[PDB]
Paper text:
In this paper we describe the structure of an (R)-amine aminotransferase (AT-ωTA) from Aspergillus terreus. ω-Transaminases catalyse the transfer of an amino group from a primary amino donor to a carbonyl acceptor with pyridoxal 5′-phosphate (PLP) as cofactor. Based on homology models of (R)-selective ω-aminotransferases, which have been published recently, and due to sequence similarities these enzymes are predicted to belong to fold class IV as well. Amino acids of both subunits contribute to the formation of the active site of the (R)-transaminase from A. terreus, which is located at the dimer interface of the two subunits.
The crystal structure of AT-ωTA was determined by X-ray crystallography at a resolution of 1.6 Å. The asymmetric unit contains two polypeptide chains which form a stable dimer with a contact surface of 2198 Å2 spanning 40 interface residues, which corresponds to 14.6% of the total surface area (PDBSum,). The electron density in the active site pocket is well defined and interpreted as two distinct states: (i) free Lys180 and Lys180 covalently bound to the pyridoxal-5′-phosphate (PLP) and (ii) N-({3-hydroxy-2-methyl-5-[(phosphonooxy)methyl]pyridin-4-yl}methyl)-D-glutamic acid (ligand code: PGD). We have selected the glutamic acid adduct, as it best illustrated the length of the observed density without complicating the final structure interpretation. The entrance cavity is capped by a flexible beta hairpin spanning 15 residues (121–136) thereby limiting the access to the active site. The large binding pocket is surrounded by the residues His55*, Tyr60, Phe115, Glu117, Arg128*, Leu182 and Trp184, (*indicates that the residues belongs to the other chain); thus, hydrophobic residues and an arginine residue as described for (S)-transaminases are present. Interestingly, the side chain is slightly kinked out of the active site to create room for the binding of the L-glutamate or alternatively acetophenone, as shown in the docking.
Author numbering:
A (entry chain B), B (entry chain A): 1 to 325
Amino acid sequence: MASMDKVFAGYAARQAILESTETTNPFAKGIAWVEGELVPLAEARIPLLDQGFMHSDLTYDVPSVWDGRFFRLDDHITRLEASCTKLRLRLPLPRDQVKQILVEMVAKSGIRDAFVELIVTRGLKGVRGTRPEDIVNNLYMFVQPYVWVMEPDMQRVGGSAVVARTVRRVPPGAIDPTVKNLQWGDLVRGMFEAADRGATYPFLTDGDAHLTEGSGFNIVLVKDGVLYTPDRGVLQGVTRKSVINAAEAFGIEVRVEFVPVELAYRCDEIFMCTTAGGIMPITTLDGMPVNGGQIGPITKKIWDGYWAMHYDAAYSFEIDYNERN
Amino acid sequence: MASMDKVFAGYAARQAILESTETTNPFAKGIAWVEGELVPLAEARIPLLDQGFMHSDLTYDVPSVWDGRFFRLDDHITRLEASCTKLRLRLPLPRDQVKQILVEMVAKSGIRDAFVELIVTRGLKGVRGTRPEDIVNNLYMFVQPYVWVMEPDMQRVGGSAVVARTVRRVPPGAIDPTVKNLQWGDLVRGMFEAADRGATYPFLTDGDAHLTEGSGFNIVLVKDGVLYTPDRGVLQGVTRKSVINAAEAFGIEVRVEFVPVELAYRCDEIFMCTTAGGIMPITTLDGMPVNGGQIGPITKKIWDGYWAMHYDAAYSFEIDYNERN
Ligand SMILES: Cc1ncc(COP(=O)(O)O)c(CN[C@H](CCC(=O)O)C(=O)O)c1O
Ligand SMILES: Cc1ncc(COP(=O)(O)O)c(CN[C@H](CCC(=O)O)C(=O)O)c1O
Ligand SMILES: [Ca+2]
Ligand SMILES: [Cl-]
Ligand SMILES: [Cl-]
Ligand SMILES: [Cl-]
Ligand SMILES: [Cl-]
Ligand SMILES: [Cl-]
Ligand SMILES: [Cl-]
Ligand SMILES: [Cl-]
Ligand SMILES: [Cl-]
Ligand SMILES: [Cl-]
Ligand SMILES: [Cl-]
């Protein structure tokens, strides 16, 4: 219930070092792997005919680095492989080589707090009209400075959400939300709706009176000392997984189940969770304060627990930035 | 009711001529417009950070050229602008300039039968966390040899379809299907399902016992001299529009309305329609011959009518090759 000052101050200090190197290190603003070559992220290009662009025929995943430590990298690569399997894709390199490249990329960038993305696409030939044996999947990877879906200043007070009414989440029988994907048509609609309504974060329903997820995050409700989070219709987030780990360590019950929309209007606390920002409190919903409008005690406990895990060998490992090896 | 021989023979003759130019015209296999530069299609590259790739945050449209005549180009540009408006995008160049560039591209390629695609993306900055004033949309365009969703020799016989059971169409309240888009998660699932079931084409339902569309085409049923095609849940196809034009000219009623799945099992004829292939008969459905399994008389009449429209000044214009239209 009190790690924010230190977590954010550490980040600010590391950030200041990174920023100072932007004119000397061409990778300080990010680095990409394309067709076996490493290039500054702003200069990275992909073939126009890649079906990842032509029909968003891809999956992706986003591990992260915090304070020079990769967080749950194996979980993210395993989820990527699972997503590939569901799409009949195959990770184009052995996963141990992939890990080695990522660590090399991070080390070269000098970035201590990083957003790391891997993308596997169908390749230069589409599914339609192609012999399955002629299909060759493509891999793209990049590392960039850590991305905040909720900035540190706002995490201190909580953000503003709406339950979206002009859009609902793509259902699993159309697109499987457990397959991480970049088909964000509904999520972008949600972001526009939130903004139109004077808020920031959209919570999308399943179009059947139950909650799913938002534009880049899972949703957790807190009521009478219990956490509630949607089971079906959502990405099985690694942050959400970490929230469950922390809750279990603290003796807090977590129910991963169908969550009726009505619970969002009568719960004690709300937070979002995602790799790109961590634990993100929501203190206004549909223009109304959430139970008084302050960040709640269980949210604070989970917040602290989540960041503590980033230093636990069971969930993280230290990257060697030395040059080299 | 028999224009197939002449239409396909003409195409074959033009294909042979096109092929003979490939060793001397670097654009004969296709040409792309990227950031104001014209490049061979295979060499075209886009920024990795373009949000058209990063979150498929884009719309697109696909006019075509047949026998050196652009087909309904104005309709396609108008639909593109409509799609852009619905996504809060804006065509980055005046539409008259866009048409001029397209004609120039086709002429340089020397392609007489062409698939032409325009893509408008959100640009290098995403909706999330960006000042709306800081967003600059991007334009990509390319011309390639005509693409067949059903090959000419399969159109002579008819194709096999299934009503998909493992996937349904993304509903409009999640992603608006009247906005042409490349978020094909459900459509690719449909293609895999069709293949798994020994058929070529998937027909997707609305997940509520009514038909919508398939993987790159609209669906038309013929029953007792009347055409039926889904109103809601689908792209408002320009080919479908052309089918309606031809049918009205022929005195054939067309009902654009809710089409129950059951009608597909008791109708007299079925065909698919799309810019990438035209009029595409379906003669087996779920492994069962459609009303005897032969291409039907109304399908043939529409087939002929559709291709005749490609030479009709009301619907087309001739491109001036080596001099621009
Ligand atoms: C739809 C969706 N649901 C849930 C999550 C949370 O899952 P995890 O805890 O495994 O991260 C994400 C993460 N999406 C953000 C990217 C969003 C952006 O950059 O705008 C991420 O990959 O972290 C997401 O995109
Ligand atoms: C989902 C969908 N519905 C209907 C249609 C028919 O609409 P129109 O008659 O306006 O073309 C298309 C055409 N999409 C094809 C896909 C091409 C491909 O798969 O390679 C196109 O863009 O021409 C489509 O993609
Ligand atoms: Ca450390
Ligand atoms: Cl530190
Ligand atoms: Cl999974
Ligand atoms: Cl509301
Ligand atoms: Cl999805
Ligand atoms: Cl290791
Ligand atoms: Cl000819
Ligand atoms: Cl089209
Ligand atoms: Cl139109
Ligand atoms: Cl079935
Ligand atoms: Cl769609």
